[PDB]
Design a protein around this nucleic acid. Structure first.
Length: 344
DNA sequence: ATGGCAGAGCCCGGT
DNA sequence: TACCGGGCTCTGCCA
DNA sequence: ATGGCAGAGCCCGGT
DNA sequence: TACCGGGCTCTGCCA
């Protein structure tokens, strides 16, 4: 500055004209403005060029507008910047098409940042962690936000997971980490706060030794680290109480969960109802806890399966109820073999 | 999960 | 020259 | 015989 | 959440 002022007089509004039009010629303008209002109060939008870019990568005009719908801000970013970022993805992705499939799945990922520097940092950091192009690909598809993450953030998660494995005397923490990321691609987009808590859950809940704990966290209990605040704690408490209500043991319950931790992902009501319905048909509580995977089956199949079995002149306290959580093929297979067998 | 949300900072234009 | 602050953007957190 | 073989079930990972 | 099924394992049978 250094000269003078403005206008001071009732002035006509001046908006980005081409915007509204070009958009409607493809996109759901209503939804966008719901999500990213400020984009529309913006002038000089690079919407136009954007389209041609995506088009050059072989993207259906349909899906293109679908992307702007859920993430209006895509318009904001220049084609020259997008080109590099795209190429960075190419490292791990190998294919222009997969990137497309991932964008039409979660647009945020690619567009929530223009920082390609940091994006390069992230990629070369994740390789330095010992990851195969195959694995980073796994990450990129499932948890694309991971690379939109600040390098400091990603570095913090890793350092945390290392310190953790380390603190249990893991002879190779960076590898401990490697395993987790394989069993749980969405690990890098979770707060250390969350994970730390969820780990402390596993710790106190189960009474294992350092080694058993380590193996768990890598193995079956990896997914448990994504769980929401106090969800795991609640979900388990529910299980514990239901089983305890049936005369079980603190240690009986632990094995049951540890032998099949996916039970935590069941809705508290889904679980209770499944157990109750098995109980209804006089199926020993012990039969269940020693065949936890029978709780895979929807109560619907689980129920009919039973009735079918019973009617086929069978004895549910005698038989091997793994049958219930079997393929429609394999189940029907043993069923006839049985109805025929009990048919003598 | 991805979409919503909020705290912090930046762009930018106005005295 | 200095100083203000509106409003978008960015990053990370939640479920 | 013990090694080959087959029917049945389980581990486990992939949608 | 539900559901599938590939392929190893287990048990028992044969000569």
């Amino acid at each position: 500055f250094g000269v003078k002022c403005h206008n001071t007089d009732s002035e006509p509004l001046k908006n980005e004209d081409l915007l509204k039009n070009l958009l409607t010629m493809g996109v759901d303008i209503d939804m966008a403005r719901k999500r990213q209002p400020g984009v529309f109060h913006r002038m000089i939008t690079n919407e136009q060029d954007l389209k041609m870019f995506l088009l050059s990568k072989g993207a259906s005009k349909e899906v293109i507008a679908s992307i702007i719908s859920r993430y209006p801000r895509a318009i904001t970013r220049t084609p020259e910047n997008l080109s590099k970022r795209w190429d960075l993805w190419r490292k791990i992705v190998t294919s222009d098409l997969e990137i497309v499939n991932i964008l039409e799945r979660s647009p945020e990922s690619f567009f929530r940042s223009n920082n390609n520097l940091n994006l390069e940092n992230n990629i070369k950091f994740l390789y330095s962690v010992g990851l195969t192009r195959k694995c980073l690909c796994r990450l990129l598809t499932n948890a694309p936000r991971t690379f939109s993450n600040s390098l400091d953030l990603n570095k913090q998660m890793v350092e945390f997971l290392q310190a953790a494995g380390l603190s249990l005397g893991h002879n190779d923490p960076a590898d401990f980490v490697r395993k987790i990321i394989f069993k749980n691609p969405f690990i890098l987009i979770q707060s250390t706060k969350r994970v730390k808590a969820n780990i402390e859950f596993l710790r106190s809940t189960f009474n294992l030794n350092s080694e058993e704990l380590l193996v768990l966290i890598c193995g079956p209990g990896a997914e448990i680290l994504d769980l929401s605040n106090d969800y795991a704690r609640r979900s388990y408490a529910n299980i514990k109480e239901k089983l305890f209500s049936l005369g079980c043991t603190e240690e009986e319950v632990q094995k049951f969960v540890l032998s099949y931790p996916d039970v935590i992902f069941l809705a508290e009501k889904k679980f209770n109802d499944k157990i109750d319905c098995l109980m209804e048909e006089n199926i020993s509580i012990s039969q269940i806890i020693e065949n936890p995977r029978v709780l895979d089956s929807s109560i619907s199949t689980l129920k009919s399966r039973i009735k079918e079995l019973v009617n086929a002149g069978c004895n549910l306290s005698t038989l091997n109820i793994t049958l219930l959580s079997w393929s429609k093929k394999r189940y029907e297979a043993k069923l006839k073999k049985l109805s025929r067998f009990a048919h003598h």
